């Protein structure tokens with residue numbers, strides 16, 4: 001079969017597969033560029049246009065995206081540099097975790113599947129944080145960046161796009177509800193950004209509520225909601241009021257408590273007190 005990992009596409013090859021980048025092939029504009037669906041060389045792909053100058057530092061950051069290899073990361077099939085930057089990722093037929101949890105049309109995710117998806121996502125971020133030196137950071141961990149396949153397994157998407165945008169152009173970076181206090185207010189960058197954002201994802205798996213809760217014009221975070229649920233006389237009853245109503249009562253209360261306790265540690269104000277992604281993996285494995 002194929003031994004090479006990435007393929008350098010050509011501009012003419014990408015334009016033909018997307019009808020010269022027509023609006024029909026355009027599947028997304030989630031930020032930092034637009035996304036196009038494409039069928040490239042016997043595979044369903046997703047072309048992500050990014051407007052960046054092709055500097056050597058930009059290419060060095062592009063090598064990090066083409067060299068990473070993990071089952072819990074969405075595969076970067078190829079890239080294209082002629083003109084602007086085009087990133088070709090593998091296509092996951094089922095949507096992201098946010099569409100499963102906060103959306104209707106798909107059957108409710110079983111609790112065991114949520115423990116599996118959380119563990120799958122944690123292993124993907126652990127690989128990012130520990131595979132090389134200096135430490136690399138995803139910088140935009142959120143439910144929409146966790147893709148689910150037909151087997152209900154997790155894959156982290158859009159890794160390194162933040163760094164590529166910043167080095168190519170050297171809210172700015174991040175999603176509301178997923179930013180730690182030291183980054184949202186002061187821009188302090190560290191791997192604890194992803195740990196904090198992951199804790200919110202655990203909160204979403206428990207509650208199926210958005211990171212920013214939907215009186216009006218005043219936002220309230222899901223992190224604050226768990227603070228009010230677990231720091232009360234009966235922490236178990238406060239947590240039971242928060243669990244996804246779609247799950248009904250089909251969940252181990254102790255296992256959901258342990259995941260909520262894990263999200264608490266991830267969402268601490270002091271980033272030094274947050275656990276590493278490695279500790280989160282070993283902690284999630286005791287629930288699976």
Ligand SMILES: Nc1ncnc2c1ncn2[C@@H]1O[C@H](COP(=O)(O)OP(=O)(O)NP(=O)(O)O)[C@@H](O)[C@H]1O
Nearest residue numbers: 028029030031035046074089090091092144145158
């Ligand atoms: N590799 C992929 N396979 C399948 N669907 C994808 C893939 N990448 C993106 N999508 C879908 O396309 C949409 C476009 O958004 P995406 O490009 O993922 O950015 P986002 O999640 O909206 N936020 P940002 O990372 O800030 O741009 C997503 O919401 C996914 O549903």
